[model samples]
Each structure stands twice: as structure tokens, then as C-alpha cells.
Target: IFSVDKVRADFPVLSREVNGLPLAYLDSAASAQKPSQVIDAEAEFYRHGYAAVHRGIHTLSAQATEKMENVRKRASLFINARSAEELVFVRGTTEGINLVANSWGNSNVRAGDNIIISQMEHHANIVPWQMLCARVGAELRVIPLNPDGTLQLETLPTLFDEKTRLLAITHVSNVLGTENPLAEMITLAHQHGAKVLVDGAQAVMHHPVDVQALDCDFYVFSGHKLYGPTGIGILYVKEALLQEMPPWEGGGSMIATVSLSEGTTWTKAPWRFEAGTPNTGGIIGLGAALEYVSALGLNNIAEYEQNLMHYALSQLESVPDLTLYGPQNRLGVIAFNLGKHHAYDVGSFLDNYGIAVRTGHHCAMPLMAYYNVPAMCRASLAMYNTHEEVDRLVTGLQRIHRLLG
Candidate 1:
């Protein structure tokens, strides 16, 4: 096994302490700690390579344009997308989904058509479809999860029908950590002549996502969630799908030609979706983050994370008054409640010790309500975390539990 300190060194923040004690960050699900490489990349961009991309002809513009396209290429390679044209960079998954809903969802979905999603979807995955359904007079159907926080395949067919136009679902549940069977789900949707859009925001950091192997009609992810910079994301639309749909955003860099007497043709699939000035620095920083993660090897990261999760879960389970949520064979994230104590209280208490964790409905309010709870305490792990850090978290939680009792 790789040395735990060796891995932790990649993240400079891990060196500090919380409230005079060592800091233990267990909230990677919401966002991640920055590696030195990622931080340096962003700083360098701001320090030197500050220029607009694809809009100017100056030297700085040319360099920025090259870097921008390089990031797109890297993103395509990272996801194993068919081509760069199939990848469109948006603000994040929320905007990516909105682009598709307005462009693809608006054009194809009729009044009586149905949109299917999973019960474990984040609000970003649910709200856009809800708006689409309401606007088009369509219906939003959901695939329910079993008690263990997995999809109940027996009821899958009941959730989809001939009128189903699209299946919007998460590749993994951020709260439950259930890695859904996406490839199989895609096949099911195809059988019904419906397209699938996998919300990849939660999955990209954990596994190797090959858009080709999954062959989902659409895939979306935020750069920040994947250890990249924020305000930059990818929306992979099938080449043919984007070819047929109209541009979601109407502005520069998306037109073929415009004349007074005739209409204009869109530039192409990906460029057609990108409107005015794009987030140039953020996109470049995202590429740096991708390169940083890729060099360490995603498979290696997965193995390390699994080990850390197993260790953390085992340790957390041993603590009294702690109730863990989600499946046993789940991802690196763990959502739990501590013995009738309000989640916010536990979260604040942890914060006092410099142990940061997310506490709330996790943007899945309906799912929270289903469990008869208002909020939860979420401890999410990443490759950079170590067994030592996991032990620190356990120690902190135990102390907090005893003090409160």
C-alpha cells in the first residue's frame, strides 16, 4: 500500500489543524480540497495567461484558445467521449442539464410524453425535468430505491413506458453512495426507444466513466466535483442528438452565417451550445486538475478510496449513538445521524474541532423526508484521504458524542 502521508502531501490543506487540533475534512461530496498542482495551475493562469479565449486574434488570445481546446480534448479523453464535438463545456451540471432540457427536451418532448428519473437524484437532476414537464404538460416519473438504497429492478418497468422520452438519472447517489447500474439502465431505456441522460457529477471522481461503453444519450458533470476548478463542466451529447437539436444559447461562436433574407445555421454540436465568453481560466484549471488526477491513475485512486471508505465505515460503526445510512458495499461517502442529536448540532460541534462535514437535506429533501428526517451528517472521502485521517475523524466524533451526552 502507498504511504498515507505520501498521498496526503498532495493536498496542502491537510497539513493544518482545526481549533488547535489537526483538521479532518470529511466533506468531499460537496467539494474537494485543492492539491498543490491544481492550486498552482489556477494561480499561474491568473498571473500570466490571462486572456479571453476564441474571441480575439492577439498573441495572448491565441495561447488562451489553444489552452482552452486542450482542456476540451483532455476532458474528452478523460470520459472516453467519442469526440470533442460531443463535449460541450457549461457552467456546471445544472446548466448542462438545462441546456439539454431547453434544446433537446423542448424540441422532442410532447405534452403527453413522460420523463423518468431516479429517487436518489440530486435537486440539480430533478428540478430541470420538473420544469420541463410542467412547461410541456408532460409527467416526471421516478425509479424508486430499495431499503438498502439501491434501485429496485422489479419496479423499473413500472416507472418507464412507451411515452417515456428521456430517462434522467444519477450514475451514483451522492448521499446513499449507491453506484447504480448505468450501462444496464441505458440498455433498458434503449429497448423502450428512449434516451438516457446520466448525471455524472458524483460518479466521475470515483470511477472510470467511458461514455462510449455506457452509450448514454447524454452525460454531465461539474469540474469542481472531480477535483477540478468550479464554474466549468462538461455536457456530452451524442453527435447525432446535438446535430438535430437547436442551440440552447443564442449568441456569438454558434452561427454558420446570418443574412437579412435567410436564417443562420449553427456552427456545430459542442460549439453551438457554448454562447458568449466562456470561463477560460476555469476550463484551463479543470484540465490541470484532470491531468493531476489522471497521472496518479484513476484505478489506483479507486482502490485507495475503497480502502479508506471501508476503514472509515468500520470505525464510524463502532462509535455509539451513530447510525450510518446507505448500503454496506457503497462508495466512499457515508451519511449518518448521531443518536437523535440534531444533524446541525453534530456538524457544528465537529466544526468546532476543525472537522468539517456537510449537514442538511443534501439537496435531496424528498429523500430526507422519506426517511422521516430533516437532515443528515455526510462524511465523504476522496483518494487523497488516508487511514490516519479516517482514524482522526473517528476520534473526533467519539469525543463529541461523549461531551454532548
Candidate 2:
């Protein structure tokens, strides 16, 4: 159902390597490797069509503006949003959450209101709410997780109440690679009249999402995590909520007019939220990235990566003293800790073979503590990864373990 060989050719960097070994990239959960189409889009934008979007009537400016809008449409389709105008471009997931926390959350919630989140939240999802809760006297409620690094959905009925104004949670946990059942979570939140926000920084790479179907009030993902450049991302706010929220930052493009008498009439929805000169080039690149992924078939990529993950897991299962994290059915990511071997050392040894993996709390320090580990070595796969790559990673891990012992 999938052409793995063709998919592998699209990523130029995959052909390059370190220390005479073919690179085994296993960090898609942190950020996806860029494909040639995405790279070319950025390059072409700067090389030929560079201009400030929405600011001029010149041909170059008009063309750039149109490309920017095209990206918005592409983003809407990728997430199955109702309209392109519902999307707000930001730096990444962090900025997206902050935009809402400062703009929407600040505008609506008063003292003693509540915001809820799950224990598996990345710090990006955590801090923004904490800041909002502190500013208002709103309480922050965190739903606990099960031992398998999955949400204890059965406990949600008791957790969500009328006071829970917004429930911000990860659609997939980066640390554990567990996919959340968004349909169920959204239904539960709606029962209490609480808006739901899904952080899709990790989810987008694993599977397709339908924001309207999920009925989430807000959804966000970083461009880099989706194989596009950094400094660009999208925040999709429901139109109904978008109309109610104010702009996060005061700026030029957002305001229709400003004068002594008529303060300002803000642009509606997306433009209202975007404050300044956007990352026009990154927007183009992101759109190209989406197109590339769509051609590969989202479900097919998910299956391919999941298979590679299984292959890698089976190969590593026999390693003495290796402790794997989470359930067997995890999304193409595995977290493990070698007994008495710190994560960084494991990462450093793997580096000798040019196999790239993440080593740390993975921005989920609280989850790490809850799991009772200082840190974990994480191998995260993506669409371009192969069983051959998995074999290389396993071979490297064996070498790493030998050195450690």
C-alpha cells in the first residue's frame, strides 16, 4: 500500500550520514526530517518570489500573499477544518497555545474559573495555562495518567465539571508515544460544556486529524514537527470561538484602522490573530510538506512507521537490563532506560554510530518523575524510516550496551 523506497528518496538528508554509518534518524516525535519538496519550497520562495505578504499591490507582493493564503487552505485540509480563515499561523505549538492563553483565555476567564489539562502534557501546553491561571484566579486541574502512560479516561467524568472552562491536552504523548482517543475525550469535555484544545505537535506525524470531526475548540502543531521549517506553525481555532477572542498582540496588519476617535477595527478570525509580518517562506514550505505527506497516504505512513517500530522493539527486547516504556501498541516511538546507565550516555554511545535519538525528560519532566526515572532514551520513527534502519539502530544499540557494560 506504500512505496517506502520512493518516500525515502524525498528526504535528501537521509542520504547523508556521520562517522561512515547511514544515519538512523529516530527523533520524529521531536521534529521530523525535511523532504526535498519542503526544502525546495523555502528555497524557491526566497530565491524568486520573496516579498511581504498582504502589504503591497506589486505583482511580487500579490503572488506572495496568494501563496500564504494557499498554505492556510492546505493547513485547513490537512486538519479537516471547515474554513481556511479558521487557521492562525504562529511560530509553532508553543506560540499557538500562548496566543490563546493570552488572547482568548485572558479575555474570557475570570477569577475562580478553571482550566484543565492531562498529566502527559508537554511543557508548552502546561506553562501557558499556568500563566493564564495565575493572572486570573482560575484553578488548573490536571487529569492523571495510568501506569501505561495512557490517560485514565474512566476518571474523566469525575474530573470534568462546569467550572472546567477549557481542557488542553496532547493528542499524542511525545514521551510515551501513546495515541489519545480524541473522539471520546472531546465528547466527555462537551458533556460539561468545556472547550477542548488538542496539542498536535506529536499527533500530526502519526495520523490524519479532522478538527471539525473531533469537535475541538482549538488545535495546534509545529511546522518543524510536521517536516516543515521552524519559526512557523498553525493554530486552528473554531470560528465561533475566534469571533469571541481578542488579538493576543497589538500590531499593524491585525487592525483595520486606528485613530484617536475610532480606536481600531480588528480583522476577523485569522488576520485578527496574526500580529505582524508572518513567516511567508515557512508557510510555503509547510504547504509543500503537507502535499508530500498526502501523496504518501497518512494511514500508509502510519502503518509503515508502526511496522518499523515493532521491528526495532523486537530486536531490542533481548538487550539485557533494557526497560521499555509504555504499552506495546505505541505510536512509532519507544522510550527506554538501560539499568544504571543515564540517558545521555546511551545517546552519546549511539551517536558514535551516527544513529540519532533523543535523550532527556523530553520536555515532560513531570511525566518522567511520575514514571520514576531521571530521563529516557527515545527512538521515534517516521514515514521515511525502514526495517533496515531499524536493524541499524538495533545493531548500534547492541554496540552501545556492550560499551556501557
Candidate 3:
């Protein structure tokens, strides 16, 4: 359905070598390789236009503000959010989750209230709530997983009650590669008078997201995972909910007015959360990255990745002593282990063959404990990855097995 060669060409680093072998990047879940367009967008912004936003009336400032807001518009369209005003730019998904945990969770959740999360959440989705529940004396409840690494949806009803305040879950598991049934989960949460926040850091790159259709109260994702520059991300809050929550950070841009004798008032949603001067160049580059992905069409990319996942899974199954994790139906991500071999040793062996893959707990230690392993090897694919790359990965593992014997 798409040109894999053309997509590969856009990423300059793919042609490079490591350990005198061709670089086979399979760690898109950690951070995607950027296309030249995203790189050039950031450099060009710094070269021709650089200014502190929302501070001055000068030309550079005006251009900077326009670029920043334009990114908000692009992100709003990317996620199908209700309005640009509901979006808040942050350092990344971790910061976005923290913002909501502190601002919304603190205000709404009290002692004896409950927060529901799944066992597959990354630390970003897990830790902030741990802290919030500790501070407020609220209880933290977990939704367990099935044997096949999928969620136990039947247990969701038993977890929700009148005291349930929020449901935080991942749209896709970074380690397990299992996509959650978000629409059903959101409905269950809402029926119990709870809000839902989806961690979309993995989902956005692999598939299309419609917050309106999902009916999630909030969504969060990082830019670096989407082939964009780092140091920028988005938090999509519902318009009505944004009006209800208090601001988390305090600084120049967030305040409507400051007084020494009296107190201070904050601006409305977007500006209210953006405390500092904002990462203008990163925001511009993120806009370019979103546009780049949109032009390719998310449906086309998703279909390609799904096919690649099947190819990778089939190839990996043939490797001696190799065992794969997660469900058969997944995005372009695979987590697995070699029989009794430490994950780092397997990762190093592949690195010698110039193959790149993530190893260890993948920021989901609870998941590792559930599976009864310290860590595993994760090979995450992207649209630009090829069938030949999957073959190389499989061959590399086989080579390691032979050498060990």
C-alpha cells in the first residue's frame, strides 16, 4: 500500500553503519528516528526566527507566537481534539501526566477515593498517581492482565465504584505491545462517574487517534516518539474539564495578573498550564513532524506496520530458543527472550550484527515481575522498517544461538 524504500530514504540515519554493519533500527518505541524534514524545521526556526514567545511586540516574537499556536492547531487536528485551547504543551508525556495528577487528581480525589490503572502502565503513568494517592490518602486499584498479555476486561466492573475517581491506562503497551480496548474501558469508567486519561505515547505513531470518539477526558503523548524533536509534547484535556481543573505550574505566562499584597489569578486553559517561555523551536518541529505523518496518512502507515509486525513475529518464531511476549495481534513491537539468556547479552549480540533493539524492563517493571523475568529484548518497528530488516533480526538471533552452542 506504500513505498517502503521512499519512506526509508527520508531518514538519513538509516543508511549509516554501526560496527561495520548496516544499522537496523528496531527501537522506535524508545524514540523514533527523525526524518530530515523534522530536523530542518527545528534548524530553520533557530536560524531565521528566534524569540521568546508571548512577551514582546517585535517581529521575531510575533513569528514565534504564530509558530507555537500553529503547532497547537496541528496537534488538535492530529488527535481530533475538540479545540486548540484544550491542548497544553509540555516537556513530554511524563510532565503532562504529572500536571494532571497534581492539578486535577489533587483537587478531585480525596481520602477513601480510588484511582484505577492497569498492570501494563509505564512508570510515567504509574508514579505520579502513586505520589498523588499517597498525598491525598486515596487508594490505588489495579486492573490485572490475562495470560496472553491482554487486559482482563471482565474484571473492570468489579474495580469501578462510586469512589472511583479516574481511570489511567495506556492505549498500547510499550513492553507487551498489546493494544487496550479503550472505548469499552472509557465507557466503564464514565458509568461510574470517573474520568479517563490515555497514555498515547505509543498509540499515536502506530495508529490514528480520535479523542472525541474514544470519549477520553484527557490524552497525553510525546513528540520524540512521533519522529519529532524532543523537549516537546502535548496534553489534550476536555474543554469542560479544563475549565474545572486548577493550574499546576506558576510563572510568567500562566498568570493573568500578579500582586504582592493580594493574590494572583491565572489565564484560561492552554496558557494557564504553560508556565515558562515554552520550547518554540521544538514546537515548530513537532508541527512539521505531525504534518509529515499526516501526509503519509495514518491509515496507510498503520496497515504497513501491522503487516511488518506479522512478518517480524513469524521470523522471530523460527529462531532457536527464542520466545516472544504479548498477543499475536499487535502493533509493530515485539518483546521476547532467548532461553535462560540475559536480555542484555542478547541485545549486545544483536548490536554486534549492527541491529538495535531495546532491552530490560522497558519502564514496566511490574509487567516484568508478572512474567517472572528481570528483563526482555524489545524490537519495535516503524513504517520505514522493511521485511529484510526482520530477516536480519531473526538471522542475528540464530547466529547468537549457534555461537552459544
Candidate 4:
């Protein structure tokens, strides 16, 4: 159902030499290398069809507006959202979370109300709530992690109360690769009448997301992480909740009517939330990216990556003095460190062999502190990666361990 070599050919950058060695890009979790389909689609739009969406009277504007709106349908169908109106495009996951925090969070969360998050959440998910809590005088309650980096779900019983306003958590940990039990967690939050916002930055590309099934109030992800262009991402707000949230930003496109002496009437749902000129080309790039993934079949991609994940874990475990963080059977991402060696040193050594892996706190400083390490080297797999690349990574790490030891 999936062909790695065929898929590799679609990504032109994979053929480029790095330090005179074959590039083994294992950092898909940070940002995926774009396929030519997405590249060509964006280029084609600029080459022939380009104009401002939801504005202008010319032919370009009409075509551009149609193209951009159709993508909303595509994205909503991909995640099984009830309507296209629920999808709001933002810069990326970071910006999407900030939009929610600044708008919905501020509107609903009251003084002395409590919010829930987890130790395994990315800083993008954690820091915004801190700012919100500080702004509203709301209490922030974090779910602790087990030694293996999985959330202590049992802790949920004690943490939730009537005053709990929301629970913001990640569907998958960017650093640890732990897939949180979202269904149960969402249900538990709802039991206490608290809404859930799932940061799906790492989960959307790897797993199929049905927002209705999960019953989450909000979901967000970045296009770049899904083999699309940068400067474009999505926020899926439940329609009912979306109506209650106020506009986060004020700009030309978001307003229905403006007055110098009177209050401005705002547009509805997505437009009210999305201010300023939208990223026209970036949204076009995402349409191609989602289309490419759909043709490949999300289930087949997940199945293929699962095989890669199992092999990667066992091979990395064989290296002496290497301590792997997080639980076994991770999704597509792995976090580990070599002996007591610094993550930066291990990463630099791997670069010699053209093996690319992300090393550092991965923007989750709280999780780093919890693990008692400043950094870790993470190797995350994507659909285009092969066993050969995994073999190269294992050898690269082994070479480092043999020499460093």
C-alpha cells in the first residue's frame, strides 16, 4: 500500500548530499521535508493563480477564494470535523494555542478556576496556559508522569474539581513519543464539566484523528510537520464552543463593519478568530500535502511506520550505556542519550555520517526537568524513511559509543 523508495523520490531534498554523505533525515517530528507535489502546487499557484482570498473583485480573487475555501473542506474531512466552519487557519501549533489561550481561555476561565495539563506537554501547550492563569488568577494543575514518561492518569481523580474550566493536553508527546490516552482523559475531563483542547502537533500525521469520536473541544496542528509549507496550521474548535469565544485579533478581513464612533461588528466563527491577510500560498501548499497523504492512505502509513518504530527501538537499545527515555513501543519518535555524554555531542557526531536527528530539550523544558536531563537526541521516522536509514543511524550511534567509551 506504501512504497518508501517511491515516496522518497517525491521529496527532492532527500537526494541532496550532506557533508559529502547521503542525507538520512530523521528529524520529521521537528518539520518534515516537503514533497514535490506540495512544492509544485505552491509554485503553480504563484505562477498562474494568485490573489487575495475573501477580497477583491477580479477573476484572481474569485479563483483564489474558491481554492482556499475548498481546503477547509479537505481539512475538516480529514479530521472528521462536523463542519468546515470549525477549522481556523493560523501560523502553526504555537500560534493556534496562543489564539485559544488569548481568546477562548480568557473568555471562559474565571478567577480561582483550575486548568489541567501534563508534564509531557510541549512548551507551546504549557506556557500559554501559564500566561492565561496569570492573567485570570486561575490555578494551573499538572498531571504528573510515571517514571517511564506516561501520564499518571490515576492522578486525574484527585486533580479535577467543579471549578476546573479546561484541560489542555497533547495527543502525543513531541519529545517522549508517548501517545496519551486521549479518549479516557477527555471523558474524565467532561465528567467534571471541563472542556479539552488537544495539541495534535505530533499526532495528526501519524494517526487518524476523528474529533467527534474523541469528543475534544479543540484540536490544533502545524502543516509543516505534515510535509506541507511553513506559516500555516489549523485550529479545530467545536462549533458550539467557537460561538462563545471572542475574537483574538482585530484586522480588516475579520470585521463585518467598522465605525469611528461606534463599536465594530465582527464576522463569525473562523473569520472572527482569523485576523489580517491569510497565508494564501501556505494554505494552498497544505491542500496538496493533505491530498498526498490521503492518496497514500493514513492507515497504511501508520502500519508501515509501526514496523520502523519497533526496529528502531530494539536496535538503539543494543548500544551499551545508552539510556532511552519514555515508554517502550513509542509512536514514530524516539528520545535517548548516549551514556553521560551531552546530547549536543552525540548529535554533532551523528552529523559526521550525515545522520540527521534532533537534539536538545525539543521545546519541552518542563519535560526535560522532569527527566533530570538538559537534552536528549531524538530520531523520529516518517513514511519516506527506510530500514537502511535506520541501519545507518544505529551504526552512526555505535561508532560514537565505541570511540567515546
Candidate 5:
């Protein structure tokens, strides 16, 4: 029922050629390629239903607001959230995290409080909390990782304390491709009376996400990585927390009333945090993309990618002097270094063969430092990727190996 060929057909760019070769996009972890369904949905929005939402009483304005509200419902169902109001539209994971930091962190975290993060966090997750800690005088703690790029969960207790107010962790490592044990991590954090925030930017596209089942206090993910358009993301706060937390930013739509001489009253959560004109086209595109992924089934996509990961790992391992990082239980990512070659050079060689991969620290500089390397070549797969593409990547690396040797 899950056919890679059929899925590939849905993405038109996959048929295009680059550098006189068929394109092989293996950088979905950075940002996934858009499907025609999502593109058409976004175009349809701009063509037929274009208006400022929540400001005008005209028919188009109402229609636009309805479309965005419908998107909220779709996103809520996608994550199995308690209510649509619990979902807030953001620029991406970075903005979502910053919102929590400036809003929840500012209000909840105080001097002498501790905020824990993992060593494998993307810069998006790290910098915001660091800034929050700096401003509030809170201690920023980190959970270490094992040699295989997995978290050292046993040592998590060592970092916990009464002062630990929050634990922000990545649901999956963008560079290492490690799917973290989020449920156990959340349970541990909860036992210590600390809330948990999950960066689901990478994990959401790989598998199904049920926030209620995971029971994280907050979760953030970017729509672009979910086969959707850019400039739109989702931040799902626990319903109780939403009711308690104050708005992060203040502007139009977030205020109930503003008297220049008196004071200002804020709106409810979600919208209270939105602050300005939302990304109408991006939200519509994301809704269509979610619907597409849901119809295809996340489980099916996971199964397909899992097999691709295995196949890719085997092929890459066969390349002489190639060293792979991360655990064997990775999703669809393979980060590796070929001999003493620089990742940039390796990536360039692959590009000559029309293969696209991600290089550099990948916003996980700490993880790169853990491996004692500055950078590594990462080949991240998606459901649209094929065994042939894996073969091509392996073959390209082999060619590089021979050329450098």
C-alpha cells in the first residue's frame, strides 16, 4: 500500500535533473521538499480567499478566518491535542521556543531555578533557553549523551533537583538521527515537578505524534519539514499551561481592549500569543500537507523510511574508511565522515553527482564537539527517497574515496 514510486510522483521536483543527473534529495531533515498538493493548496488560498483575517466583516475576511481556524483544527487533530486553541502559530521551532522562553520562562523561571537541556539540542532549542536563563538568573543544566549519540538517561536523575523548573529536549536529533526516548524523559521530568518541552521539527515528519499520549508540557515543530510551506509552525501547549501562562508578545488581535490612559487587557492563550497577522498561505499549505501525510499514514511512511535507513546504513558502511555516527536505531539520517576528508568536500563531490545532503554542525555544535570533529556529512532520507538514491549516495562516496586515495 505504501509505494515509494507513487509517493515520489506526488513531488514534481523529484523528476527534475541537476548537474546532468536525476536529483536525489537527502536533506529532508533540514527541510523537506514540497508536494504538489501542498503547493496547490497554498496557491488556491491566494487565488480565491485572500483577505486580512479577524479584522474585517467582509465575506473574504470571514472566509480567510474560517480557513485559518480550520487549519488550527487540522493541526490539533494531527497532534491529538486537547483543543485547537492550545495550538499557536509561529514562524518555526525557533520562534516557538523563544515565545516560551520570553513568556513562560520569564514568568515561571526565577533566580536560582534550573532549566535542563540535552547535549544533542539544535541551536534553536539551546540559545533561547540560554537567553532565558541569563535574563532570569536561572542555572542552565544539560543532560549528557552516550558515545553512540544517544542520551545518557540513567544520569538524568543526577541533574534533577527542586530548582529544576523545565527540561527542554529534542524529540529527534537533526544531525545524529537519534529518536530520543521522550516518554521516559517526560516521566522523569514530571516526577521531579519539572515541565518538558519537545522540539518535534524532525520527529513529526518521521512518525505519528500524540501529544496527549506523550504528555509533554509543550511541543514545537516547523511546517516546512512536514512537507508543507515555510514561515508557519505549531507550538502545542498543554491546555492547563495555556490557561495559566501569560502572552509572550502584545499587539493587534492579542488584546481584548487597550485604553491609552488606563491599561490593557489581554486575550486568551494561542491567539493571545499570535500578536499579528498570521501566515494564511502557509497555514493552509500546512493543513493540506498534514491531510496528505495522514491519508498516506504516518506508520506507512515510518516503515518505508526505516527500511531506507537500514539500506543506506549498509551501503555507507561498505565504503572504505567511512565512519558512521549515531545509534543503529536511527530513523532516516546517516551522518558520517569519509576518511580524513572534510564534510564540505564530500558534499561537493556528491553534488556533482546530483545528490543533495546536509553538512556542517547542523545546529548541533555540541554534538559535533562530542565526536571531536568540526563537521560531518549527513544524508537524511524521507518517504519519497528510494533505494536507488541510497545506492547513488554510496557510489558517490566510493568515488570520492577513490579520488582522494
Candidate 6:
């Protein structure tokens, strides 16, 4: 349905040489390559449309404000949010989760209440809850993971008791590429009267998301991972919850009125959550990113990446002493290692061949510990990646094992 060649052509970074050889970028799970349109959009905004949003009377402010809000409207539609006002722009997914934990989690959770997370969560999803639980004296429970890297759903029901206030979980595993089945999990959690926050940072670009259908209370994702610029992200809070939760940060633009004696009267759901000056240029660029990816269609992007992952897995399996982590079926991310070789060494070897891959813990230390491996070399894909790039990686791995297996 989509053309990989055409997609590849849009990203200028793909054309540049890494070290006298063509770049084989396979670290998209960390952050994707920005399409030219996204790059140009920000520069174009900064070139002409420069001003603070929602605060100026000048044309610059109005123009900038209009552009920024348009993205908010567009992004809500992108995720099938109930309304434009439900999505708040933050620095990235990290900030989004912190906002939820600090504001909503702090307000709702009390002593003896339990919050549920999974074994597959990124630190963004895990650490915030731990902080929240610690701050409130609430218990934090983890949904167990099977050996294949999938969550043990049979154990989920037991994890939630009457005191369960929330389920903070990942929509996709960054390390394993496992897509969690949130539909059933959310449904059950709702029956038990617990709210759910989905970490959609890795999930959004790889699959279509309909927040209304998922019935999640909150959803968060980073813009950079979706081919948008860094320092911008979307946090969608269900309207009722948004209204109920208190504002996390304090500053200008988040308040309806403030007084030295009476304190501050907060604004609406999203604006109240976003404090200080927002990233206007980054926001406009994100709008362009949504326009670009939506046209290509997430289903097509999902299909393309799925095929690429399978092709990569089979190819990696061909390398001697190479063992892949995660389930047989997964999304665009593939983590593997050569026998007795440190992940960084393999990644460095691939880099010499002009291949880009993510090494180290991939920021999922718990998952790494579960697998009994220190680290893994992760080769993840976006739509622009090719089978040829997979071959480059396979060849690089074969050479690494021969020299340093």
C-alpha cells in the first residue's frame, strides 16, 4: 500500500554516509529519522511564524497560537481523542507520565492503595509509579511476564484488588517488541473501577490507535519516536479524569486567575496541565509529522514494519551463535546478541560497517535481568527501512561473530 523507496527518499539522513559506507539506520525504536517535511515545517515556522502562543496580541502570537492549537486538534483526531482539549503537549513521554503521576496519581492514590504495572515497562512507565507509590504510601504491584516476553494475563485479575487505583502499563515492549493486549486488560480494570494509563511511546508509530475504542483513561507518547521533532509529545487524558485531576506544575498560562492571598484558580484540563512556555515550533512540526504519517496510513506502516521485522529475525537466526530475544511474533524491534559477546562490542562492530543499532539495556533493565542477559543489540525499523539494510546488518553480525564471537 506504501512505497518504501518513496518513504526512504523523504528522509535526507538516510542518504548520508556514516563512515565511508551507506548508513544502515536500525535504531528507530529509540528515535526515528525525521522526514524532510517535518524538518522544513519547524524551520519554516521559526523563519516566519515566531511568537508565544496564547499570550500575545500581535499577529505573531495569533499566527503561532493558531498553528500550535491546530496540531492539538489534529493530534486528538490522530488518536481518536474525545475532543481537542483532552491532549496536552509536553516535553515528551517522560514528562507526560510524570504529569500523570504527580497530578492524578498523587491526588487519587492514598495510603494502602495499590497501583499495577507490568514487567515489560520502560523506566518512564515504572519509575514514576514507584515515586507515586512511595510518596503516597501506596503499594506497587507488577503483572508477571511469561518467558516468551508476553505478560501473564491469567495473573492480572489477582493483581487487582479493591484497593487498586490504577494500572500503568506499556502498549508495546521496547526491548521485546511485544504488543500488550490492552483491550482485555483495560476492560477488566474498568470493571474493577481502576483507571489505566497506556505508554504509547513505542506503540503509536507502529500501529493505529483509537483511544475511544481502547477506553483508556490516559495515553502518552513521544513525538520524536513518531518522526516528529524532539521536545514535544502528546498526553491524552479522558475528559472526566482531566477535569477531576489537579494541575501538576505552576506557572503562567495554566491559571484562570492568581492572587497572593487567595492562591491560583486553574484553567481547563490541558492548558492547566501545560505550564511555562510551550514548544511552538516543535508543535507545528509535529502537526506536519501527523499529516505526513496519517497520509501514509498507520496500517500500511504497521504492515511494512511487521514484514521487515520477520525478515530481520530470520536473517539474524542465520548468524552463527546469535540468539534473538522476545517472542517469535513482534513489531519492528528485534533484540539479539552473539554468544559471549558484549552488546556494545557487537554494536561497535556494526557501526564500523556503517550500521546504526541501539545497544546497552535499551532502558529496560528489569527485562534484561529477566532474560539473564546484561544487554542486547537492538535493530528496530521504521517504514523507510529496507530488506537491503537487514542484509547489511546480517552480514555485519556474521563478521562480528567470526572475529569476536
The estimated TM-scores of all candidates read 0.96, 0.97, 0.99, 0.99, 0.99, 0.98
Q: lDDT tens string, model 5, 1-405?
A: 599988988998999999999999999889899989999999988998899998589999998999899999989999999899999999999999999898889889999999999899999999999999999999999999899989988887789989999999999899888999899889989998999999999999888899999999999999999999999999999988988888887889999999999999998877899888888889999999999999999999999889888888877778999998999998778899999999999999999999999889998999999899999999988999999999999999999999997
lDDT of 2 by residue, 364-395 (tens): 98889888888999988788888877787777
Candidate 4 lDDT for residue 203: 89
The runs of at least 3 residues in candidate 3 whose Cα sits more than 4 Å from the true structure, single-residue gaps closed, are: none
Q: For model 1, what is the error of residue 329's alpha carbon versus the real structure, in angstroms, after optimal superposition?
A: 1.1
Clashing pairs in 6: none
- How does residue 315 of candidate 4 score in lDDT? 83
Give the Cα error of residue 21 in candidate 2, in Å: 2.9
Candidate 6 lands at a TM-score of 0.98
Please give, for residues 177-209, the per-residue lDDT of candidate 4 as tens digits.
Answer: 899989999998999999999999998899789
Q: Which stretches of candidate 1 lie over 4 Å from their true place?
A: 1-3, 258-264
* Model 2 TM-score on a 0 to 1 scale: 0.97
Report clashes for each candidate as comma-separated counts. Answer: 0, 0, 0, 0, 0, 0
lDDT of 3 by residue, 284-322 (tens): 999999999998989999999888988888778788888
Model 6: lDDT equals 0.91
Q: List the residue pairs that clash in candidate 3.
A: none
Each model's lDDT comes to: 0.87, 0.87, 0.92, 0.92, 0.92, 0.91
